[PDB]
């Protein structure tokens, strides 16, 4: 599991750093996180960085990222009261998990692309589901797809990933032997199916892009996300 603190307080104009430990080596030897922004839980997280210093370019310059040896640090030059939230670390734990995501830190302050999820609503315990997120706004076909679900008040947990080309597929602990992720790239569409559902599957279930230029999926590298899909496991 990643580590970064829990909570940081911050004056209006002050200066901010948030940093993230415990990600995996990378292939490269080298080491590589992710910052997600959410507001409140259940709503798309914002990435403000991602591959340890990128920057979208709708985020506001204030925002930056560096990373030291296997440490990545977020740095918010001039905070505002707007930039209150709960920031996620991302990163890889392990060649066979590519996407693990922090406890979050909760920020106060002191005083395009379109991911669509389906495929959610109740659901019977023990049954199966199945999530489609039709993608659009970019080329489908170059990218690493995500899937990443949020248990009511809870932090983001990875669900599984694909690559561009379907190979390279690997599943969250909590779902390994359970789950399947597939995509078409004709279609734009990536696909989660989860099976033998219990209460503990409840949650929002986002989709999510990855911007790695070789078509991969990590922790530290998605780019954007969908407004996600509730799920309801009861009976």
């Known amino acids: 599991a990643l580590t970064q603190p829990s909570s940081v307080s911050a004056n209006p104009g002050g200066t901010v750093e948030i940093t993230c430990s415990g990600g995996?080596?990378?292939?490269?030897?080298?080491?590589?996180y992710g910052w997600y922004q959410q507001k409140s839980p259940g709503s798309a997280p914002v990435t403000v960085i991602y591959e340890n210093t990128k920057r979208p370019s709708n985020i506001p310059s204030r925002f930056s990222g560096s990373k030291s040896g296997s440490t990545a640090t977020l740095t918010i030059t001039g905070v505002r009261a707007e930039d209150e939230a709960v920031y996620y670390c991302g990163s890889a734990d392990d060649n066979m998990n590519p996407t693990i995501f922090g406890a979050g830190t909760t920020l106060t302050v002191l005083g395009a692309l379109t991911l669509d999820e389906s495929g959610g609503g109740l659901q019977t315990p023990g049954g199966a589901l199945s999530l489609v997120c039709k993608a659009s706004?970019?080329?489908?076909?170059?990218?690493?797809m995500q899937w990443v679900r949020q248990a009511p008040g809870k932090g983001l947990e990875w669900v599984a990933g694909?690559?561009?080309?379907?190979?390279?597929?690997y599943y969250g602990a909590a779902v390994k032997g359970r789950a399947t992720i597939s995509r078409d790239n004709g279609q734009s569409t990536v696909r989660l199916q989860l099976n033998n559902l219990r209460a503990e599957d409840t949650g929002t279930y986002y989709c999510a892009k990855d911007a790695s230029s070789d078509g991969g999926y990590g922790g530290d590298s998605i780019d954007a996300w969908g407004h996600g899909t509730e799920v309801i496991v009861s009976s």
């Open positions: 706004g970019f080329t489908f076909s170059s990218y690493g």
């Open positions: 694909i690559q561009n080309d379907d190979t390279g597929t």
């Open positions: 995996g080596r990378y292939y490269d030897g080298s080491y590589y």
